[PDB]
Amino acid sequence: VSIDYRHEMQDGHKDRLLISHRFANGFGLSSEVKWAQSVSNGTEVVASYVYKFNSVFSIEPGFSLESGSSNNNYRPYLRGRANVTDDLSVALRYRPYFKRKGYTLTGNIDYTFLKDYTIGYELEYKKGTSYDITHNVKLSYKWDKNWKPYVEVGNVSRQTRYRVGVQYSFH
Ligand SMILES: O=C(O)[C@H]1O[C@H](O[C@@H]2[C@H](O)[C@@H](O)[C@@H](O[C@@H]3[C@H](O)[C@@H](O)[C@@H](O[C@@H]4[C@H](O)[C@@H](O)[C@@H](O[C@@H]5[C@H](O)[C@@H](O)[C@@H](O)O[C@@H]5C(=O)O)O[C@@H]4C(=O)O)O[C@@H]3C(=O)O)O[C@@H]2C(=O)O)[C@H](O)[C@@H](O)[C@H]1O
Ligand SMILES: CCCCCCCCOCCOCCOCCOCCO
Ligand SMILES: CCCCCCCCOCCOCCOCCOCCO
Ligand SMILES: CCCCCCCC
Ligand SMILES: CCCCCCCC
Ligand SMILES: CCCCCCCC
Ligand SMILES: CCCCCCCC
């Protein structure tokens, strides 16, 4: 089980607390409380299964619902992942959204170095139906077996988005 707090700012601010767990059988579940000001709030829940074909490739179908003051939306997904080495993995996710319509396509490259550091590149395309492009860089550090602080800097277009957070892992 892990508890992840994150603070986000652009250019008011957003906060989240994400609680999740991945079972050894590949089933996973998470719940996220979110709050923001420029005031708003919301709750997202996610269920998924990682099916691994082997040590290189896996697929992850997912289901999510969000309920909040601003909006609600349903966002199922399918993430493929390829571990090209022990230290290097790539993934691609298709995630439609239906909100009170469109999809995102998200590519990730994650590289672990010096045991405890991971640098991630993320490229995300969002297209509505009735483009935005994100370039995001994440650096995280496994401080000890329980704590992993991290920072991310991304562009959205023009505007810069900053995140700092920490993940707590239970043992
Ligand atoms: O229209 C709206 O409702 C909003 O649109 C905007 O939001 C963006 C984005 O478009 C949303 O999809 C969303 O992002 C997702 C999460 O909320 C966010 O914390 C983050 O997720 C991480 C991780 O990057 C992601 O890959 C995934 O992790 C999987 C899996 O779910 C986990 O269980 C675990 O197995 O690890 C996996 C992994 O590492 O890949 O979920 C993570 C998590 O924290 O749960 O990205 C998600 C995503 O990209 O889909 O919110 C964004 C936001 O900025 O809020 C817009 O910004 C907003 O204003 C609304 O209008
Ligand atoms: C393998 C499945 C393990 C699931 C364990 C987590 C379930 C523990 O119960 C928590 C339920 O909490 C309900 C909170 O109430 C909020 C109201 O909305 C809930 C609608 O589902
Ligand atoms: C055989 C294993 C399958 C692995 C699953 C990978 C995830 C599925 O990807 C779906 C591809 O959808 C791409 C849609 O692209 C639309 C056009 O691109 C956006 C430009 O406007
Ligand atoms: C297992 C910890 C995640 C909490 C999920 C709650 C689902 C309603
Ligand atoms: C009670 C929240 C969980 C709903 C999604 C679970 C689908 C398996
Ligand atoms: C609603 C279950 C998830 C479906 C995943 C395939 C479409 C993204
Ligand atoms: C401020 C860090 C949030 C996670 C800590 C979990 C407390 C048991």
Which domains does the chain possess?
1-171 (2.40.160.40)
Closest by Cα among 102, 161, 113 to 135: 161
For residue 21 the two structure tokens come to: 């767990």
Q: Whose CA is nearest to atom 18 of ligand 3?
A: 105
80 lines ligand 3 (CB under 6 A): yes
* E strand segments, the chain: 2-10, 13-22, 27-37, 40-49, 51-52, 57-68, 73-74, 77-83, 88-99, 102-113, 117-128, 132-141, 147-156, 159-169
Residue nearest (by alpha carbon) to ligand 3 atom 12 = 94
Contacts of 170 (CB under 8 A, 6+ apart): 1, 2, 146
Query: What are the structure tokens assigned to 74, written together?
Result: 């349903």
Model resolution, angstroms: 2.1
Of the candidates 33, 68, 65, 34, the residue with the CA atom closest to the CA atom of residue 48: 65
Residue whose CA is at the smallest distance from ligand 7 atom 1: 5
Residue 146 DSSP class:
S
Number of residues assigned to the chain: 171
Atom of ligand 1 nearest to the CA of 73: 3
Ligand 3 midpoint to CA 54 (Å) = 21
Place of tokens 């997912």: 62
* Residue minimizing CA distance to atom 8 of ligand 6: 77
Instruction: Name the experimental technique.
Output: X-ray
Confirm if 136 and 121 have CB atoms less than 8 A apart: yes
Phi, then psi, of 155 in degrees rounded to 5: -105, 150
Contact 97, 73 (CB under 8 A): yes
Beta-carbon contacts of residue 132 (< 8 Å; ≥ 6 apart): 125, 126, 156, 157
- Report CA dihedral (45, 22, 78, 53) to the nearest 10 degrees: -170
- The residue assigned the tokens 């989240």 is 16
Within 10 angstroms of residue 21's Cβ, the number of other Cβ atoms is: 12
10 Å CB burial of residue 25 (0-12, 13-18, 19+) is: exposed
Ligand 6 atom closest to the Cα of residue 62 is 3
Q: Which one, of 104, 133, 139, lies nearest residue 120 by Cα?
A: 139
